[PDB]
Design a protein that fits this description.
Elements (H helix, E strand, L loop, with lengths): L4 E3 L4 H18 L4 E15 L2 E16 L19 E11 L4 E11 L1
Length: 112
């Protein structure tokens, strides 16, 4: 039913959605010069009429790579005391599977 269920990142569709959220965070939301990737992720999905909804609670950490830099997401985190920036965000993402459509319904971030 239209009930919200928990999932993990082993589902290819969930991964795709998370990737979309990580991309937007780094390009639109976060204005730092360094790339931030997830430290922790909690996920849930909901099937509605017309598409699917993904909910993510993500904790981001600052890496040692600049956003303009190639081959990311394998970038070590900046463990340096004082330079370690982390932030928690919750994302509500909507996807129409059979149409390659995906968007961010809403998000709320907070420096941790």
């Amino acid at each position: 039913a239209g009930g919200i269920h928990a999932t993990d990142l082993n589902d290819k569709s969930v991964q795709r959605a998370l990737d979309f959220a990580i991309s937007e965070y780094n390009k639109v939301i976060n204005k730092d010069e360094y790339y931030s990737r997830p430290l922790q992720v909690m996920a849930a999905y909901q099937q509605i009429v017309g598409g699917v909804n993904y909910y993510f609670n993500v904790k981001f950490g600052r890496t040692t790579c600049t956003k303009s830099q190639p081959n990311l997401d394998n970038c070590p985190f900046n463990d340096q005391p004082k330079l370690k920036e982390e932030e928690f965000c919750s994302f509500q993402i909507n996807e129409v599977p059979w149409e390659d459509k995906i968007s961010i319904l809403n998000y709320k971030c907070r420096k941790v």
